[model samples]
Target: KLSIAVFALGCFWGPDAQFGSIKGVVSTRVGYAGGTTNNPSYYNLGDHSESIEIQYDANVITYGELLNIFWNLHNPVYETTNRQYMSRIFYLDDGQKSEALEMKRQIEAANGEKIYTEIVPLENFYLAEGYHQKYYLQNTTKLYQTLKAIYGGFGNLVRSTLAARMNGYIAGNLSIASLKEEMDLVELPEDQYEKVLSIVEEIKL
Candidate 1:
C-alpha cells in the first residue's frame, strides 16, 4: 500500500531534494502546511510553514525508514513555532499516524526529551508556488544561506551525511563529505567554513 508523510523543516527545499532521492519515494512535493489561512502562498503571513508531501511504497521503504529520515533531518530540540524552521510530522493514514508517534516515543526515550517535534494530521497543505519546488539546485545561493542559518542543525547533516555515505559506494570519492567535514573538523570560529565552501564550489563544474 502507499503511505504518505507531510513534513515541514524550514524552507523545504533541501528536504525536497533529500527525500526525493530515496529509493521508495514515489514523489515529493513542496508546499505550505499546518496553518489557519486558506491556500497561503510563500508570501502569505498565515500560520503556514514550509512542508513536503511524500508518497512512498510501504513495503519497500516502510514508515519506519521515513521516520528515521525525519529524525535525522532537523533539530528536534528546538521549537519551530518561534523560528520559521520548525520540523513537523504529518501523518496521512492511521498507520502513518501511529508510526510517527511511536517513533517520537522511541526518540524521546533515548534522547531524554531533546526531541521536540510536533506530530499532527495532514491538513490543508497548499502546494507552494512553483518557485519553491526544487529550489536548492535551482537557486543554490538561497539554499546555501538557509543552510548557514541552520549551521549546526541536524538539517545540515543530511547533506554532509549523504555525501559521506555515498563515498562508500565509490572509493576515494569523498570530496563532498570531506568538504563539509574539514569545515567542522577544525571548528573555526567564523567565516572559516564559508571560506572552504567558496573554494569547494569553485571546483564543481
Candidate 2:
C-alpha cells in the first residue's frame, strides 16, 4: 500500500527531485516542515522551516530503503538546527519514528565523530505554489520533445485515476468544448496532464 513520510534534510529541490525519481513513489511534494507557523514565506525564516513530503509504496519499498535513500541524499550533520536547511527527519507515524531511531543508532555506530539529527513527528505541511509542484517534468518538456512523447505511457500508468475523475469526458461520452473546459478545470501538475492526454488518445479523431 502507498504511504507517506516527510523529511527535512537539505535543499528540498534536490530531495524532491531525488525521491521523485524512484519507482514506487506515488508523488513527491515540497513544503515547510517542523517549527510552528502558518503560510510561511520562503524568503522569511520567522518560525517556519522547509521540507519535502514523499508518498511512496510501503509494501513494495521497505522503510529501511526509505531511510537509506534519506541518509545518502543529504548530510545529517549541520548547524542551522532550525531550517529545512538543517538535517532533520520528520516522521508521520510511530513506525517511521522507530525507523528514524534505528537509523540514528546505525549512524552513530558507523562514526566516532559527534553528529545530532533531529527525528521528530511531523506537524504541518503547506502546499507550495503551482509552479513548484513539478519543476523538472515541466522544464524538461519545454527543452526536449523526446520527453513529451512519453506522455502516452505515463498516461497508461495513471489512467484509472484520470478516467475516474473524468467520467463524462470519455471517448464518445463527452463533447469537444466540454472536454477542453474540463481539462482546463483540472490541475494535473505533471501526471494528471499525462492522464488527460491518454484519455484524449481514445477520442475518435
Candidate 3:
C-alpha cells in the first residue's frame, strides 16, 4: 500500500519538484496545509502554509528517508515572519507524528540549533488550482497540451504519475537517465510515449 506525507518548506513549487522526483514517490501535489480555512485558495489561504503532499510506495521508501529529504532541502531553523511560508511537518497519524518529532530532534541536535519548523497533525489539504499544479511542466505549451489530451480530464493531468515525473524533470530535479529508466514502470500508449519523447527533446537538461 502507498503512504502519504505532507510538508511545508517555504515555497510549494520547489518542494513539489524535490519530492516528486524521488525514486519511490508515486505523485506529488502542492496545496495549503495546517490551516483552519475552508477551501483555501492561493490569495486567501487563511492560516495555512504553502505545502506539498507526497504519495509513495512505503516498501520502496521509508518514512525516515522522506524526513531526511525534507531536512536536507530546507533549514528548519530559519527565521520566518509569516505562517504562509513557514516550515511544517503535517503528520497524518500517531506513527508519523512520532517519526516527525524524532527527526526534528535529531536534526536539531546534530546542527546545534533549535528548529523553527512546526510539527503538527494534518487536518486538511486543499489542492492548489490547475495553474499552480505543475509549475514548470505546464509552462511547456506543447507538453501540457499533449498530456491534457491523453489524460482526458484536466484534473487527471494533475494527479498523473507521469505528470509528477515530468514536472520534476522539467525543473531539472530528475536525471534524464533516471526518467528513461522509469518509463517501463508507467505504462503509456505509443502516441503518449512519443509525446513524452517530444518533451525530452524540447526540454533541455
Candidate 4:
C-alpha cells in the first residue's frame, strides 16, 4: 500500500528534491499545509507553511526510515516563528503521529536539547501553483523536454515517477549511478535513453 508523508522543512523546494530522491518515494508535490487558510497560494499563504506532500511505497521503505532522512535534512532544533517556513511533521494517522513524536524525542535525547519542530496531525494540503511543482526539473531544458515528451505535458511530468527521479537527480539529491540504475529498470526508446544520457553529461552531474 502507498502512504503519504507531509513535511514543512524550510521551503518545499528543497524537501521536494531531497525526499524525491529516495528509493521508495513515487511522487512529490509542493503545497501549503498546517494552516487554516481556505486556499493558500504562494504569495498569500495565511498561517500556512510551504510544505511537500510525498507519496511512497511502504514496502520499499518504512516511515521510520523516511523519518531518519527528514530529521537530518533540516534544523529541527531551531525555532521559527514564521509559519511560512517553520519545521513541521504533519502525520496522516495517530500511528504516524506517534512515530514522529517518538523519533523527535530520540533526536532530542541524542543531542540533549529541545527541538522546535512541530509534530501535528495533517489537516489539509492545498496544491501549490504549477510553477512551484518540480521546480528543479522544469529549469533544465533538455531534461524537461525528454520527460515532457514521454508524459505529453508539463503537468503530467509532475505526476510521473520518472520525473520525480529526474528532478531529484537534477537537484543533486540523487547520485548519477542511482539515477542510471533507476532508468535501466524501465524500457525506453533508444533516442529517449540517449537524450537522458546526454542531459546527464551536459549537466555535468
Candidate 5:
C-alpha cells in the first residue's frame, strides 16, 4: 500500500529531489500549500509555503523514518517569518499529527532548542507549474529529452519512479551504489542507461 506526506522545509525544489531519493518513495511533486490562497503560483504565492508531496510504499519506509529525514534536512529551530520558506509538516490525519508532535517534542528535549517547525493540518496543495516538476531532470537537456520521450509528457514524467530516482541522483542525493542497485528497474536503452550511470558516477555527493 502507499501513503502520502507533505513537508515544507524551504524551497520545494530541493526537498522534491531529496525525498525522491529514498528507496520507498514512489513519486514526488512540488507545490504551494499550508495557507489560503486562490490558485497560488510561484511568483504570486500570497500566504502559501513551498511544499513537496511524497507518495511512498508504506511497507518499505515508515512515516516515522520520513519524519527523521525531514528533521535532519533543515534547521527547524531557527525561526523564519517568511511564510513561503518556513519549516512545516502538513499532516494529513490525527495519527500523522500525533507522530509529528512526538517527534518534535523528542528533538526539542534532546537538543534543548525550541523548534519553529509548524505541525499543521494540510489545507490545499496546488500543484506548481510544469517547469517546477522534476526540476533537476528537466534542467538536464539530454536526460530530460530521453525521459520525456519515454514518459510522453511532463505529467507522466513527474509521476515516474525512474524519473524520481534520476532526479535524486542528479541532485547529489543518491550514491552510485544506490543508483546501480535499482538500475534494472530504470529500463533505459543501453546508451541511455550508460549515460545515467556515468552521470551518477560524476556526481560529487
Candidate 6:
C-alpha cells in the first residue's frame, strides 16, 4: 500500500531529493503548503511554506522512519522568520499527529532544546510549476531531455519513480552501490541502465 507524507523543511528542492533517495519511497514532488494563502507560487507564496509531498510504500517504510528523516534533515530548534522557508510538519491524521508529537518530545528530552518545527494538520497542497519538479535532474540537459522524451513529457517525468531516484542520484543523495542494488527495481533499459551507472560512478560519493 502507498502512504503519503508532507514536510516543510526550508527550500523544497533539497528535501525533495533527500527523501526521494530513500529505498521505500515511491515518488516525491515539491509544492507549497502550511498556510491560508490561495494558489501559492514560488514568488507570491504569501503565508505558505515550500514543502515536499512524499508517496512511499507503507509495506516497505514506516511513517516513523520518514519522521526520523524529517528531523535529521533540518535544524528544527531555530525558527525562520519567513513563512516561505519555515520548518513544519503537515500530518495527515491523528495517528501521524501523535507519532510526530511523541518524536518531538523525545528529541526535546535528549537535547533540552525546544523544537520550533510546527506540527499541524495538512490544509492544502498546491503543486508548484512544472520547472520546479525533479529540479536536480532538470539541470542535466542530456539526461533530462532523454528521460523527458522516454517518459513522454515533463509531467510524466515528474511522476516517475525512476526519475525520482535519478534526481536523487544526481543530487548526490544516492550512493553508487545503493543505486546498483535497486537497478532491477527501477527497470531502466539495458543501455540506459549502463549509462546511468556510468554517470553515477563518475559522481563523487
Question: Which ten residues in a row are the worst by lDDT in model 6?
Answer: 196-205
lDDT of 6 by residue, 1-205 (tens): 5899999999888998899899889899999998897898888898999999999999999999999999999867886688898999999999999999999999999999999999999999999988899899899887788778877999888897878887898888987677677666767789977876666666543
Clash count per candidate: 1, 0, 0, 0, 0, 0
Candidate 2, which ten residues in sequence have the lowest lDDT sum? 157-166
lDDT of 5 by residue, 97-129 (tens): 999999999999999999999999999899999
lDDT of 2: 0.61
lDDT string, candidate 1, 1-205, tens digits: 4667788777776677667656666666678888888878766647877888877777778888988987887766865464346778877778878888888888888878767777788778787775565454334454344344544642343334232222221222335554465446547556745764564556353
Quantify all predictions' global Cα lDDT against the true fold.
0.64, 0.61, 0.85, 0.87, 0.87, 0.88
Candidate 2: clashing residue pairs, number:
0
lDDT of 5 at 21: 95
How would you encode candidate 2's per-residue C-alpha lDDT over 1-205 as one tens digit per residue? 4688887776676666566655456567777767787787677546545677777777777777878888887656655656657777888889889988987788878975445678888888876654454444334343113223433543332222222223333313345455555455445466756655554554434
> What would the TM-score be for candidate 1 when compared with the true structure?
0.65
Query: Alpha-carbon error at 124 in model 2, in Å?
Result: 1.0
Instruction: Rate residue 164 of model 4 by lDDT.
Output: 84
Per-residue alpha-carbon lDDT of candidate 4 for residues 10-121, written as tens digits (9 for 90 to 100): 8888888888889988888999999997898999999999999989999898889988988888867777699999999999998899999898888889899898989988
Native-to-model Cα distance after best TM-score fit, residue 109 in candidate 3, in Å? 1.6
Cα-based RMSD of candidate 6: 1.7
* TM-score versus the correct structure, for each prediction: 0.65, 0.66, 0.93, 0.96, 0.92, 0.93
Candidate 6 TM-score over all chains jointly: 0.93
* Candidate 2 TM-score over all chains jointly: 0.66
Runs in model 6 lying further than 4 Å from the true structure: 202-205
List where candidate 3 sits over 4 angstroms from the true fold: none
For model 6, how many clashes?
A: 0
